[PDB]
Amino acid sequence: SMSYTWTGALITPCVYATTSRSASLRQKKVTFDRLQVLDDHYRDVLKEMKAKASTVKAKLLSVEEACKLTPPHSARSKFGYGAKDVRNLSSKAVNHIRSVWKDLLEDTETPIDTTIMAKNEVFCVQPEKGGRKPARLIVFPDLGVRVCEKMALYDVVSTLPQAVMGSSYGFQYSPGQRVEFLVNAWKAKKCPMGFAYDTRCFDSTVTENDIRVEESIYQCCDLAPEARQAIRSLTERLYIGGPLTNSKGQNCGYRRCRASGVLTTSCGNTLTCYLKAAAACRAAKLQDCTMLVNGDDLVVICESAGTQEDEASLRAFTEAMTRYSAPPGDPPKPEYDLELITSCSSNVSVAHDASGKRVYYLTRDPTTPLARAAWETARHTPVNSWLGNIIMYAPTLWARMILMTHFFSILLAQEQLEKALDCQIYGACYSIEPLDLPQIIQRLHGLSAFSLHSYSPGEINRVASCLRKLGVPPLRVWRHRARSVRARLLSQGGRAATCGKYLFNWAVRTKLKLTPIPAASQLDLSSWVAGYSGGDIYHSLSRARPRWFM
Ligand SMILES: O=C(O)/C=C/c1ccc(NC(=O)C2(NC(=O)c3ccc4c(C5CCCCC5)c5n(c4c3)CC(=O)Nc3ccccc3-5)CCCC2)cc1
Numbered sequence: 001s002m003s004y005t006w007t008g009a010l011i012t013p014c015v016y017a018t019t020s021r022s023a024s025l026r027q028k029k030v031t032f033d034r035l036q037v038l039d040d041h042y043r044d045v046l047k048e049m050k051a052k053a054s055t056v057k058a059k060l061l062s063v064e065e066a067c068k069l070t071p072p073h074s075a076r077s078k079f080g081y082g083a084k085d086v087r088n089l090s091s092k093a094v095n096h097i098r099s100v101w102k103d104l105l106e107d108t109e110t111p112i113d114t115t116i117m118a119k120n121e122v123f124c125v126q127p128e129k130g131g132r133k134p135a136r137l138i139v140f141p142d143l144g145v146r147v148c149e150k151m152a153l154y155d156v157v158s159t160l161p162q163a164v165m166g167s168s169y170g171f172q173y174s175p176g177q178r179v180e181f182l183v184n185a186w187k188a189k190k191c192p193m194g195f196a197y198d199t200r201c202f203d204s205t206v207t208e209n210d211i212r213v214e215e216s217i218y219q220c221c222d223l224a225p226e227a228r229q230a231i232r233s234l235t236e237r238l239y240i241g242g243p244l245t246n247s248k249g250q251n252c253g254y255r256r257c258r259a260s261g262v263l264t265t266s267c268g269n270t271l272t273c274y275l276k277a278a279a280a281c282r283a284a285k286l287q288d289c290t291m292l293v294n295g296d297d298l299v300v301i302c303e304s305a306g307t308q309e310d311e312a313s314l315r316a317f318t319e320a321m322t323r324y325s326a327p328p329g330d331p332p333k334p335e336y337d338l339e340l341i342t343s344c345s346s347n348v349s350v351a352h353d354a355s356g357k358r359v360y361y362l363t364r365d366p367t368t369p370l371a372r373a374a375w376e377t378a379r380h381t382p383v384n385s386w387l388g389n390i391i392m393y394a395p396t397l398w399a400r401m402i403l404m405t406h407f408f409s410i411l412l413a414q415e416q417l418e419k420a421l422d423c424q425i426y427g428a429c430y431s432i433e434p435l436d437l438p439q440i441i442q443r444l445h446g447l448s449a450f451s452l453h454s455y456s457p458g459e460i461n462r463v464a465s466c467l468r469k470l471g472v473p474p475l476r477v478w479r480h481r482a483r484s485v486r487a488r489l490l491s492q493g494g495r496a497a498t499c500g501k502y503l504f505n506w507a508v509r510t511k512l513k514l515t516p517i518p519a520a521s522q523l524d525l526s527s528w529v530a531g532y533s534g535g536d537i538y539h540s541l542s543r544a545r546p547r548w549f550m
């Protein structure tokens with residue numbers, strides 16, 4: 001069937017940023033009929049997956065438990081109540097949720113309406129690479145449905161993917177753990193080879209059968225009968241597809257593929273992609289495959305059988321994936337250095353800590369993080385990629401020298417260090433206090449993140465070239481600026497001084513010996529686990545039992 005059908009009704013809205021005018025170009029790309037042929041390899045992997053799912057027990061979340069997970073800036077309900085009312089357990093919201101739930105338990109076929117919108121993403125615009133890129137589409141049900149999804153499937157999506165995929169489940173890793181997995185995977189092979197597999201419009205390639213296969217995996221859990229019916233009804237009425245409505249309330253068409261704004265988007269895409277990829281590994285007869293699946297993103301580390309054999313295996317892998325209804329965007333390239341694989345726009349690099357020891361870390365081209373940050377300083381935005389980039393890429397030269405320096409000088413100038421901000425980062429929305437960045441960074445990357453030096457020439461040159469291209473002052477200017485920022489932060493004591501000490505040690509002539517932050521142990525990061533991209537999940541950072549002297 002067709003991934004989408006359109007009535008022709010325009011997608012209405014509620015460093016450059018893509019608008020809902022360029023959404024028409026995206027519609028042509030994402031619209032196509034799907035051809036899917038399955039085999040024994042696919043059925044075998046599926047059964048092995050289902051067998052692992054069988055070990056899972058999932059709790060049914062209460063109205064309140066589910067309400068408390070709602071982001072405060074989550075799109076308001078067309079039934080006149082919003083994220084705040086939900087979070088506050090307002091009788092109108094709670095009563096409207098209890099009815100949506102009842103309807104899911106009682107109505108098994110009626111499609112649920114979804115809202116289609118364009119996601120305004122800030123970019124740079126490379127004139128050498130060609131032209132502009134279209135805006136991505138966000139398909140999501142009403143607030144009431146969204147709370148019900150959490151009641152039925154939050155515990156499923158939090159525990160099932162790791163039970164099924166184990167170490168292959170990307171979303172379970174902090175950036176430091178992800179790198180540890182990749183490096184060990186690489187080191188474990190006699191002669192390693194690796195590649196990234198990028199599917200052309202993954203959500204669109206997802207068939208209504210793919211969606212039932214994943215409900216079949218969810219159905220292996222020990223579920224409460226209401227959770228079972230909710231999963232069943234949500235599959236038929238929402239996940240397999242339904243009608244598309246713009247912000248103006250007009251019908252835009254109909255969908256028969258993955259909805260990007262549902263709780264099961266990351267989880268379902270991970271399971272689906274893993275299933276197809278593990279099946280394709282067998283079809284292409286790759287030896288000793290290690291997979292890292294992160295939503296629609298895939299990295300395979302296998303055993304090299306020689307340049308010509310490896311190229312042959314990859315073509316076979318692609319042919320299998322295509323049959324499974326997962327054709328590639330760009331055909332995969334085999335790589336013989338781990339640092340050469342690019343996935344989730346990232347690559348593994350190496351540096352030294354304070355004692356000369358090697359430390360691996362994730363990095364990426366800084367152009368987009370810098371442009372988005374340049375836009376975010378220019379105009380107030382409710383979701384800051386800059387803070388997600390600091391947290392995600394804390395060990396990188398560019399996050400430390402440019403992002404940290406620039407934004408702490410602004411927070412200093414606005415006496416807003418204490419003010420919690422909402423940060424994006426791939427999936428879920430996080431409420432983070434900039435003053436907590438050192439503990440966060442220590443927890444996610446290690447104390448070494450504050451002592452990294454001896455960066456590779458390639459990384460240094462990438463960062464420097466990028467600054468020149470974007471009209472950003474050079475690294476020597478940033479070192480100067482970070483010395484004032486540091487000085488002013490130190491003079492403020494407490495967490496602010498820790499920000500100056502730890503985050504800006506790189507800027508001082510004679511380096512300070514940095515001890516582990518004591519308060520880093522008391523931060524609760526238990527929730528940080530799974531990917532909830534479109535999942536509408538809110539996690540505000542908390543600390544159990546704070547020691548007074550902190
Ligand atoms: O050779 C030497 O010895 C010294 C050279 C040198 C060169 C330029 C300056 N510039 C400045 O001081 C000013 N801008 C900046 O000091 C500035 C800071 C951050 C900037 C950023 C981003 C960086 C990431 C965080 C958000 C801010 C961008 N641009 C920046 C400019 C350049 C700009 O204007 N816009 C963009 C556009 C896209 C990408 C980045 C930028 C402030 C007053 C005059 C302009 C200072 C020193």
Ligand SMILES: CNC(=O)c1c(-c2ccc(F)cc2)oc2ccc(-c3cccc(C(=O)NC(C)(C)C(=O)Nc4nncs4)c3)cc12
Pocket residue numbers: 170171172173174175178182292293294297298299338341342343344345346347348362391392425426427444527528529530531
């Ligand atoms: C298959 N591809 C991959 O696995 C990735 C590769 C890659 C690159 C090159 C390779 F040769 C291989 C793999 O680079 C990546 C960069 C980022 C992400 C990512 C995506 C989603 C969440 C988080 C995350 O870390 N988010 C934060 C809140 C910062 C976090 O800390 N999350 C946590 N989640 N649980 C505990 S902590 C990170 C994933 C990949």
